[PDB]
Amino acid sequence: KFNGLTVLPPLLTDEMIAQYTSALLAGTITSGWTFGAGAALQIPFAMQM
Amino acid sequence: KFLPFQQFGRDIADTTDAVRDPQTLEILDITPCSFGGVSVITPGTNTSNQ
Ligand SMILES: *[C@@H]1O[C@H](CO)[C@@H](O)[C@H](O)[C@H]1NC(C)=O
Ligand SMILES: *[C@@H]1O[C@H](CO)[C@@H](O)[C@H](O)[C@H]1NC(C)=O
Numbered sequence A: 001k002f003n004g005l006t007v008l009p010p011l012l013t014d015e016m017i018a019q020y021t022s023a024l025l026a027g028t029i030t031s032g033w034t035f036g037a038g039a040a041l042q043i044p045f046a047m048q049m
Numbered sequence B: 001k002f003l004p005f006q007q008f009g010r011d012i013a014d015t016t017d018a019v020r021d022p023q024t025l026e027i028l029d030i031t032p033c034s035f036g037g038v039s040v041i042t043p044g045t046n047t048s049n050q
Helices: A014-031
Strands: none
Touching: none
């Protein structure tokens, strides 16, 4: 870092990335896949299987 | 810590690291002065100027 080299921190921290991944998992586990097109719906997991 | 005959430490790649001094015996340390790349954040100059 001394001479001329600098490093810039990323715009999105690790906590925000974890929050997005958790949101995606939560959508997939319950809403099925309708939230990938429009509004999020709900449906039991066995029916999705 | 220096040996009784060691001066002018480089200690990373080529930088003049902590060095002793004449007339006395102390292990002084040298650090570069603070520096940084300033930046300006501005809105549209057609709107305001602050
Ligand atoms: C250098 O000279 C000063 C002046 O008298 C003296 O106080 C000091 O002890 C000397 N130091 C050495 C390392 O010769
Ligand atoms: C924004 O810029 C346009 C032309 O560059 C100018 O006509 C307009 O007045 C500006 N907006 C404001 C709020 O002054």
